[PDB]
């Protein structure tokens, strides 16, 4: 198996069975049409790849991802058929990460916004920098938060924190995110990647079935909320034809 | 739309599209029979009022609510028909808040007990003062905790904390409440009201569908526990016919500590 | 009602209607074949005993329980009918504790591991010492975490913390456990027992139906995850026939999977 | 007061039975006003102490042909209208299922789309042998998001739900009873009397016993709320798609659609 | 030994089938002791190595007419008794559902209320053509909260479930089988022998296979536990209402 | 796209946008090692194929599938890694079919057993021959019914019929299967194939999103039973290490 079907992504296989997946693109790793599809569809390939034992996922440089690019949001608003495509991709990103038994570790440095946040937060283990900026962003942009949060935030931070950050879109930094249960760990910015790599390395060298089946069991908690998640997806893509988003991209 | 159908409630529409809903009654805003119905029934009306874009709910003065009045409890204990009316109101309060798409911010100062705590905690964004007193209160009175906690607490503070506080009825202060995830925010007592108004104002001026649909999606987590919550409701209202609640009431009126066993 | 049908467990009924259930056995209160069955089957009996109004469950000495003994694991690996018997006990432990309406307080000093952690955490109110060691332990041994965690951890600590600790098997100390929501209370190691006995005592003097029906209502959150729990059980017991557990057990005699 | 719902004729009987009548042109088509009134009447009925049961029917020999040409046209061509219709669709199902007052439906002739929603979410549905029960969504070119995803598998089993909802083959009242979709099948002439009898007997019954039995059973539908809401969203997304123009053209032209 | 259940006659055959018979005046009416015994037997059966299947039936030509007048009176008239009867009603459904041993019911004549519970929660139910299946609760003036909310929609679909449970119209075995409420309908005289045969074959089958198939299918009911327990609470509340005192008399509310 | 990654299955793309998936193998289309994997992994590929608008799935000749082959059963009992590989495939077959938005029609003639019955019944629309034999078969073989039945039978035939057939393994013929709700339709054996094709063709010509989104919404009723289904998978594959399936196999 080769990761050439995913040309927007940089996939590197170490000797320990860790696959590094890097988001590397302009505008602090913004997610364009090709990356949005690649992020969605890579997971079932990784999960059938016998050479891979763990995934380490990150952005290049001092940033996870600023999320969807101007062009991606444009297409979503201005074209039905493209909207439908991008919607299916948003759905599958969540469904495929959640159904991937291979453990995943995220190293979150700088911003993680929208589609980028999905990947950051649906990793099994998430490592955030003290100063990392975790931004769901949807309500301020003017659309419903339908790309992951309804499937997991309550079961990460409890309903009172979830409602607060998701409705207000107040900025949440890695240190406070760790305090409230959104991420597994918080470490100094400079140590985010090495901390994550070590965990990923340990998982890769661990007892495989034990690890994967533990993951899989726990993931039933998210899968049970699949219909609630897909409601949120529908409502988000509906809202993309609404007035507010026009003002929202302008700001 | 006018809020005259809810005479125990003072409702004030702001310039900002925020409806302030004030609980104001004697005994630190105790909830009597009219207010129990009014609290239960107002939400569906609020939700269809095109002039309202957010709700700020609070108590008059420096108290949220002491919960059900002695008259309310007496009626529950002593009369079948009244018990069922109250039970329907208890159930609908939770169901109607949770099905209300309009965002709600609570400003929690002083005590928020029983039926008052329901409203304080089912608000989307709850703002508690450092020394605010959050008291479910049911097991110490001698009845099951069936008025909201079973639909939400484990998804607020996790099961180990839910069980500790709901079973022992130990008082929980605002600061500790925020630490463990029960409320959205903890501020100084003198800042609760302006902080809550700030948040309500900002939601009212935001992307309406985005906000309402996000909230609605999140509320499915509570909706999926309706049957569990309705179990808790039946168990509480059944326990009102038991001897323990008579003792709890009697102990209170008699200024002593309850002896249940 | 006589607790003589559970010979590996010491059961002492106080004046206050508190049943103290002590776990006391070699290797830090390890759970052998008899205790595994006793711990599973004791709860329905306690739940129907009118002399009991609360349970306080603890380890003898400065340990809660190290979980499965080497012999119990050996049988699980070596013998099919034994494995099935044990798997049924594992499932029943969780099911029974969760359907016990009588309130249960755990006093956690020292290690609570595997089967030991199950009982410590499915108590209604868990009191952990500052340095108590809470270790699920499954992935480190080479088996799926199928003995309780999948029914409850996401709803105790949130999924990010649940995965961290269940996948890595990093040790969790009672103070940190309390911070992230795994346990009800953290007190000084020297104050664990009295804090817990005090809590059991209050519960046992409380309004019985109110307390029991509140617990029951709350327990529906775990009961709706039964199929997810039973999934994890099967995956654990399937993985007992895998190579990794032979390596993981050998490692703990003398860890390279 | 029921004058808040001017599209619907609401007649209170001596027995405590509220009769609710869908009376309009094109075999009781549901236009803008009726779509909202149908959605919003149930919580008011539920809180009315005069009412102990509901009998719901169409005027004459028809239940409802469903959405009128106008209502569909709005859904297709106007955004804010589409949202208002969407909310209404969601609320009809949600409000019917949360109405504790028992509801009996008298199904004669066509019961299509929006009209079918009311006919099938009734607690007790009485179908004439020749009644035509038609979901209609895939044939019209939109997802079936107005009620079927919340109940059909639990009425007819997933094999029949898939067959009828995907193909949109017509279901006659007789075959509908055989497969579990409706409570009872009778001769077209007895539908109305059979239904009124049942409404009457429930209205005379033990009020809490009946309302609480129905509430309990309705949890099976409530637990499917998020699945239903997915279906609503998808139906309303599909209304911006290319198929529905051709689907409505095809309907209006008494011909088979060419997608 | 089943001596802890004095109201029930339990006979173990040479094939591993444990026959459980309800035998009591008034067509096997279920009194205080029977109500507790029926609730508390299944966990014992399920850990009994000698038992491989259960065959449950009434004595004579009747399954059970349900709770007796005195059991009902107790529910109406006293709180501690009402609560005990409630725990029993709830554990009956729970304990049958959690019993991995397969259970065949042989239903002849009436099966009403508490007795219908056992009839329908058996894994395989055999009804006679003229067996009378009567949930009975609304006719009696209480919510139907002793089992139907955990199973009927998944047996007969919601339209049929609502019709029979709201009206309490009598449902005969032949019609019960057609709508999917019972596994099988046979001629009245063949009920017991058809049921015994089925239980016999099950007692001889591959044990883990059978029990685990059944267990897995039972999750469909376990997931509906809270909805069931909602219906239990609603039934027991309604026993304090006015309707039931009249309904026990009979039927005019 | 490339159906050559599925060596055990014959995939033919029609003019009407219908992909016909033929199960054509020894022993009345028995499912061996290669077919068990191919059946599991094909569905996500189909669902992403823009050339395909509907699937017609069928066995070669007058038989759907006799299910898992002797070798597959021997591999399940005999070897741990292979047992685990087979278990994953059983799990994913059910998971992937139910998550495939593309409408699927099954044409059921003669026997459809175990692993074949899976594909047959999780088709959106199943067309059954009057004398087609639908056999779950797991209790007769000595293993828990963990390959699909626990995700769907109660919502097909109701619990009383589910427990009768799955516990006893009594034979269920296509006519009776339709009566009780297990299959969409029952036609004469000779008409199964053309009836299935017609239905596939119509669906393939329909409003694509309308159909796919309706089926997806309905399929949530199955996704919500995923953990019950996975419990059953687990109990089946555990029971393969038991003493019972030795005799069970030796018989057939």
Q: Where are the domains of chain C?
A: 1-204, 205-257
Contact, A239 vs A142, CB < 8 A? yes
Place of tokens 């969780």: C94
User: Chain E residues within 8 A (CB-CB) of chain C?
Assistant: 43, 83, 94, 98, 208, 219, 222-223, 225-226, 229
* Longest CA span, chain E: 53
Q: How far is E16 from chain B (nearest CA, A)?
A: 39
Structure tokens at C101: 């309406």
Q: HSE-up of C92 (CA within 13 Å, CB side)? A: 21
Dihedral in degrees, nearest 10, Cα atoms D58, D59, D62, D65: -60
Q: What is the dihedral of CA F165, F171, F174, F180, to 10 degrees?
A: -30
Q: How far apart are CA D149 and CA A234, in angstroms?
A: 15
Q: In sequence order, what are the residues at sequence separation of 6 or more whose Cβ sits closer than 8 angstroms to the Cβ of residue C76?
A: C68, C82, C83, C86, C237, C240
Among residues D22, D113, D119, the alpha carbon closest in space to that of D67 is found at D113
Chains F and E touch (3+ CB pairs under 8 A): yes
Residue of chain B with shortest Cα separation from D43: B44
**Where do the H-state alpha helices sit in E3-68?**
25-28, 32-46
> What's the CA gap between F71 and F74, in Å, rounded?
5
Which CATH number among 3.40.50.800, 1.20.1050.10, 1.10.10.10, 1.10.12.10 corresponds to the domain D204-259? 1.10.12.10
In the CATH hierarchy, which top-level class contains the domain E204-253? mainly alpha
Contact D180, E114 (CB under 8 A): no
* CATH, domain F205-252, list 1.10.12.10, 3.40.630.40, 3.40.50.11270, 3.20.20.70: 1.10.12.10
Do the chains contact at E151 and F144, CB–CB below 8 Å?
Answer: no
Q: Kindly tell me the sign of the dihedral angle through the C-alpha atoms of A235, A236, A242, A244.
A: positive
Q: Is CATH 3.10.20.30 correct for B205-261?
A: no
Ramachandran area for residue E57 (φ above 0: left; ψ -120 to 50: alpha; else beta): beta
Query: F149-157 vs F226-239: helix axis angle to the nearest 10?
Result: 120
Query: Which whole-number Å values give the CA distances from D245 to D137, E77, E209, F212, in the listed order?
Result: 13, 66, 54, 18
Sheet holding A125-129, edge to edge: A9-13, A18-23, A54-59, A104-108, A125-129, A185-187
Q: Are A229 and A151 in contact (CB under 8 A)?
A: yes
Q: Which residues of D touch A (CB under 8 A)?
A: 79, 83, 86, 226-227, 229-230, 232-234, 236-237, 240-242
Question: Distance of alpha carbon F221 from its chain centroid, rounded?
Answer: 17
Residue in chain E nearest F153 by alpha carbon? E217
Q: Cβ contact (<8 Å) for C184 and B160?
A: yes
Chain A residues near residue C232 by CB distance under 8 angstroms:
213-214, 217
Residues of B in contact with D223 (CB under 8 A): 224, 226-227
Size of interface B-C (CB pairs under 8 A): 129
CATH number of C205-257: 1.10.12.10
CB–CB of C231 and F231 under 8 A? yes
User: What is d(CA F104, CA A83) in angstroms, rounded to the nearest whole number?
Assistant: 26
- What the block records as the tokens of E20 is 């459980």
- Residues just before a chain gap in chain E (C–N exceeding 2.5 Å) are 250
| Option in C80, C84, C238 nearest F234 (CB) | C238
Strands A111-113 and A172-173: unpaired
Which structure tokens are listed for A123? 């990793």
Can chain B be said to touch chain F, i.e. do they have 3 or more Cβ pairs within 8 angstroms?
no
Residue C51 burial by Cβ neighbours in a 10 Å radius (0-12, 13-18, 19+): exposed
Segment (H or E) for B129: strand B125-129
Contact call for residues B123 and B57 (beta carbons, < 8 A): yes
Residue by residue, DSSP assigns C20-64 as EEEE--HHHH-B-HHHHHHHHHHHHHHHT-TT-SEEEEEESSS-S
Subunits that touch chain F (at least 3 Cβ pairs < 8 angstroms)? Answer: A, C, D, E
Using DSSP, state whether C230 is helix, strand or coil: helix
Determine phi and psi for B18, rounding to 5 degrees: -90, 125
Do domains D1-203 and D204-259 share one topology? The answer is no
CATH class (in words) of the domain with range E1-203: alpha beta
Helix (H, G, I), strand (E, B) or coil at E251: coil
Nearest to D82 by CA among D242, D226, D237: D237
Q: What is the DSSP string of chain F?
A: --GGG-TTEEEEE-TTSEEEEEE--HHHH-B-HHHHHHHHHHHHHHHT-TT-SEEEEEESTT-SB--B-HHHHHHHHH-HHHHHHHHHHHHHHHHHHHT--S-EEEEE-SEEEHHHHHHHHSSSEEEEETT-EEE--HHHHTS---SSHHHHHHHHH-HHHHHHHHHH---EEHHHHHHHTSSSEEE-GGGHHHHHHHHHHHHHTS-HHHHHHHHHHHHHHHHTTHHHHHHHHHHHHHHTTSSHHHHHHHH-
> For chain D, what is the radius of gyration of the CA atoms?
17
Cβ atoms of E228 and E93 within 8 Å: the answer is yes
Closest approach of C171 to chain F, Cα-based (Å): 29
Return phi, psi of residue F7, to 5°.
-55, -25
- Rounded to whole angstroms, what are the CA distances from C247 to A204, C250, D248, F236? 16, 5, 67, 26
Candidates C224, C238, C240, partner chain F, best to mutate (most F CBs within 10 A): C238
Experimental method: X-ray
Residues 6+ apart with CB under 8 A from F1: F45, F48, F49, F51
Chains in contact with D, counting 3 or more C-beta pairs less than 8 Å apart as contact: A, B, E, F
Q: What is the distance, to the nearest Å, from the Cα of residue F203 to the centroid of all Cα atoms in its chain?
A: 20
Q: Which residues in chain B have their CB less than 8 angstroms from residue E232's CB? A: 234
Nearest to E117 by CA among E61, E56, E159: E56
C contacts of A124 (beta carbons < 8 Å): 163, 167
Structural resolution in Å: 2.3
- Candidates D90, D159, D226: best to mutate against F (most CBs of F within 10 A) is D159
Q: Is A73 left (phi over 0), alpha (psi -120 to 50) or beta?
A: alpha
C235/F80 Cβ within 8 A: no
How far apart (Å, rounded) are the C-alpha atoms in residues D43 and D100? 9
Select A205-251's CATH number: 3.40.50.11600, 1.10.12.10, 1.10.1040.50, 3.90.650.10. 1.10.12.10
The closest alpha carbon to A38, from A22, A53, A26, belongs to: A22
Other CB atoms within 10 A of residue B97 CB = 26
Cβ-nearest to A146 among B103, B211, B217: B217
Beta A133-135 vs A172-173: how paired, if at all? antiparallel
CA dihedral over B148, B154, B160, B161, signed as positive or negative: negative
Of D94, D208, D219, the CB nearest to B227: D219
Distance in Å, alpha carbon of C28 to nearest chain E alpha carbon? 31
Q: Which two tokens stand for residue C238?
A: 């399937």
The structure tokens listed for B134 are 């959050």
Q: Do D244 and F207 touch (CB under 8 A)?
A: yes
Q: How many CB atoms lie within 10 A of CB E9?
A: 13
Fold of B1-204: 2-enoyl-CoA Hydratase; Chain A, domain 1 (3.90.226)
């Amino acid at each position: 198996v080769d990761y050439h079907d995913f040309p927007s992504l940089r996939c590197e296989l170490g000797d320990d069975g860790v696959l590094t997946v890097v988001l590397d693109s302009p505008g602090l790793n913004s997610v364009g049409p090709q990356m949005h599809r690649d992020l969605a569809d890579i997971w079932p390939v990784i999960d059938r790849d016998p050479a891979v034992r763990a995934v380490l996922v990150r952005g290049e440089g001092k940033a996870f991802s600023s999320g969807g690019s101007f062009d991606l949001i444009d297409e979503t608003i201005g074209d039905y058929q493209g909207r439908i495509r991008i919607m299916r991709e948003a759905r599958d990103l969540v469904h495929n990460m959640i159904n991937c038994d291979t453990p995943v570790v995220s190293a979150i440095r700088g911003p993680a916004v929208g589609a980028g946040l999905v990947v950051a937060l649906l990793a099994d283990i998430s490592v955030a920098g003290r100063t990392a900026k975790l931004i769901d962003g949807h309500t301020k942009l003017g659309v419903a938060a339908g790309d992951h949060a309804a499937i997991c935030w309550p079961l990460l931070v409890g309903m009172a924190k979830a409602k607060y950050y998701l409705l207000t879109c107040e900025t949440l930094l890695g240190e406070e995110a760790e305090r409230i249960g959104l991420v597994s760990l918080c470490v100094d910015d400079d140590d985010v990647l090495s901390t994550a790599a070590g965990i990923a390395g340990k998982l890769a060298q661990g007892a495989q079935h034990a690890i994967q089946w533990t993951k899989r069991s726990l993931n039933h908690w998210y899968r049970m909320m699949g219909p609630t998640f897909e409601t949120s997806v529908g409502l988000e893509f509906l809202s993309f034809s609404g007035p507010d988003v026009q003002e929202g991209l302008a700001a």
